[PDB]
Amino acid sequence: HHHHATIKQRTLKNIIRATGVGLHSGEKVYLTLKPAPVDTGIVFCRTDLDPVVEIPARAENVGETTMSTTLVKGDVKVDTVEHLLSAMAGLGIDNAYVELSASEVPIMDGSAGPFVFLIQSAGLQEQEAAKKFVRIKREVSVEEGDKRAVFVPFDGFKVSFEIDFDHPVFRRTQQASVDFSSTSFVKEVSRARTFGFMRDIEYLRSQNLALGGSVENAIVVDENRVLNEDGLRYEDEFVKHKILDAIGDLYLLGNSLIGEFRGFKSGHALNNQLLRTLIADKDAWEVVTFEDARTAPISYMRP
Numbered sequence: 001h002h003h004h005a006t007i008k009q010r011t012l013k014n015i016i017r018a019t020g021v022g023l024h025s026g027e028k029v030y031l032t033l034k035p036a037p038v039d040t041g042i043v044f045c046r047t048d049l050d051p052v053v054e055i056p057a058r059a060e061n062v063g064e065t066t067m068s069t070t071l072v073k074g075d076v077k078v079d080t081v082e083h084l085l086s087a088m089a090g091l092g093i094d095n096a097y098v099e100l101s102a103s104e105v106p107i108m109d110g111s112a113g114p115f116v117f118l119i120q121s122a123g124l125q126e127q128e129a130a131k132k133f134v135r136i137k138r139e140v141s142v143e144e145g146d147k148r149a150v151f152v153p154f155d156g157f158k159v160s161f162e163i164d165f166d167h168p169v170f171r172r173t174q175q176a177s178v179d180f181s182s183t184s185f186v187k188e189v190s191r192a193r194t195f196g197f198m199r200d201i202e203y204l205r206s207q208n209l210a211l212g213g214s215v216e217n218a219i220v221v222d223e224n225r226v227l228n229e230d231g232l233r234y235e236d237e238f239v240k241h242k243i244l245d246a247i248g249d250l251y252l253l254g255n256s257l258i259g260e261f262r263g264f265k266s267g268h269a270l271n272n273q274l275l276r277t278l279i280a281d282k283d284a285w286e287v288v289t290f291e292d293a294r295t296a297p298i299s300y301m302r303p
């Protein structure tokens with residue numbers, strides 16, 4: 001028959017298994033993504049510990065936001081969740097358990113591409129409960145110096161980002177806007193790899209960071225050019241990756257957004273400051289569901 005269909009929560013149809021290396025720790029890590037019940041959200045599970053330590057991927061659990069987005073509970077951390085969370089958000093996955101055998105999510109090829117491929121191969125499962133969205137109803141802005149991150153009301157979901165690197169590799173706009181109620185996360189953004197400049201990578205290594213980085217999982221830039229012999233996947237890959245990171249960091253809200261995000265030189269730390277300010281300002285957002293997908297401002301691929 002023909003009639004209104006609620007937009008439903010989604011989990012995984014099948015389990016996903018992957019093995020990789022942490023970008024910063026260099027450690028080998030085994031990843032298992034599992035389906036989860038309605039209203040679970042995304043939950044990270046350190047299965048190398050006894051007992052297993054579980055950390056919901058929510059803004060309140062964000063520890064340090066230095067080089068990557070890190071979740072903390074007591075003395076236990078899960079590092080670099082942003083790229084996997086970007087894949088979850090981009091495919092509309094509400095509920096899943098993410099089991100990790102080590103403290104850091106594997107970096108894969110530096111983008112969300114391998115995650116979206118593994119998830120879409122396994123397939124998604126719609127669940128018998130309405131999907132909840134957080135709708136921006138007032139402008140919310142956080143700044144620190146010359147960095148800015150803002151939420152604005154928008155009947156859809158749209159992310160804009162601008163970076164301002166003074167570096168010969170950008171002699172480029174350093175700006176991109178993507179409307180995901182219109183274009184596709186998989187198409188526009190998922191394949192954008194992380195990047196680092198050699199000067200900063202050298203410092204990071206001296207601090208026991210970036211230990212797993214290489215041309216196999218990152219765009220590596222020296223003082224003048226990209227060192228990866230096979231080049232860039234997009235002419236604006238750097239700023240597309242900033243958008244990927246933003247989508248992942250924003251999914252620490254625990255629900256998909258109906259609104260617009262605008263980032264100027266933002267990063268994990270300011271992104272999370274923006275989420276904490278939004279959450280505290282309950283006049284600026286509300287939780288909504290859609291009983292008829294045909295009238296909703298957002299749509300999703302077939303599962």
Ligand SMILES: CC(C)([C@H](NC(=O)c1ccc(C#CC#CCCO)cc1)C(=O)NO)S(=O)(=O)CC1COC1
Pocket residue numbers: 067068069082083194195196197200201204210212213214215218220245267
């Ligand atoms: C883009 C970022 C937002 C971020 N990437 C990292 O932290 C990172 C660090 C090291 C490496 C590496 C390597 C190597 C090698 C072999 C040669 O020896 C890659 C990526 C991110 O994607 N977070 O999600 S960044 O902060 O701008 C990254 C700075 C550092 O310069 C710019």
Ligand SMILES: [Mg+2]
Pocket residue numbers: 082083194241245
């Ligand atoms: Mg990143």
